[PDB]
């Protein structure tokens, strides 16, 4: 998987604690994870990794001038051809074409 | 404490601590292993 399973160290209890995490701690970190994920959803984050490019450095598409949510902040500078192609990708991801495999949809994906 | 240093159950036999030290850096300097390539002490 790409994303992080956890945020922070969710298994901190004393040694030989016979579970990965306690209820208390896991609830704290569930809170923090919740906040981060909710932030991702509402700000409408989009990331991309393109072939024949450094992968660890991911173009943030949610900041691109066309797809940018804010009306104010200066978004990002990405190549004109590449950015056109990214816009087309994000756009044609949205809806289910029959014969293609059903993939989860959301409001915040648009 | 899953996040923290490993502790021994008991101490270590000091005698063994001194036996494992035979080839240590000080003994080597005394044997003359390292080449003297510079002026050193005056």
């Amino acid at each position: 998987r790409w994303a992080a399973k956890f945020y922070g160290q969710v298994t901190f209890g004393p040694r030989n604690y016979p579970y990965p995490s306690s209820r208390w701690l896991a609830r704290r970190f569930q809170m923090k994870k919740h906040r981060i994920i909710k932030r991702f959803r509402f700000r409408r984050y989009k990331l991309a990794a393109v072939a024949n490019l450094p992968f660890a450095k991911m173009i943030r598409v949610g900041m691109l001038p066309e797809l940018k949510s804010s009306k104010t902040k200066r978004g990002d500078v990405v190549d004109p051809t590449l950015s056109g192609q990214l816009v087309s990708a994000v756009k044609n991801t949205g809806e289910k074409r029959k014969g293609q495999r059903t993939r989860p949809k959301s409001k915040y994906q648009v | 404490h899953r996040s923290g240093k490993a502790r021994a159950f008991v101490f270590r036999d000091p005698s063994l601590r001194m036996m494992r030290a035979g080839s240590g850096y000080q003994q080597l300097r005394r044997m003359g292993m390292p080449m003297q390539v510079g002026m050193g002490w005056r």
């Binding site: 922070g8 004393p14 040694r15 030989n16 604690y17 016979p18 704290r28 970190f29 923090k32 | 502790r7 021994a8 159950f9």
Partner: peptide, 24 residues
């Protein structure tokens, strides 16, 4: 996370497995 303990909770129990983990 909150950097302090919001609850004052002291369990007095000392299970032998928690303490000496070298042997259990």
């Amino acid at each position: 996370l909150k950097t302090l303990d919001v609850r004052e909770y002291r369990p007095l129990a000392m299970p032998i497995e928690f303490r000496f983990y070298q042997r259990y």
